[PDB]
Amino acid sequence: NRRVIAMPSVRKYAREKGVDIRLVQGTGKNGRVLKEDIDAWLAGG
- φ and ψ of 32, to 5 deg: -70, 140
DSSP β-bridge partners for residue 7:
none
Domain count, the chain: 1
Side-chain-side CA neighbours of residue 31 (13 Å): 8
The candidate with the shortest Cα–Cα distance to 5, out of 44, 29, 41, is: 29
Residue 18, classed as helix, strand or coil, is coil
Return the CATH number at 8: 4.10.320.10
Range of the domain at 7: 1-45
Burial letters for 15-30: b for 16+ Cβ neighbours within 10 Å, e otherwise? eeeebebeebebeeee
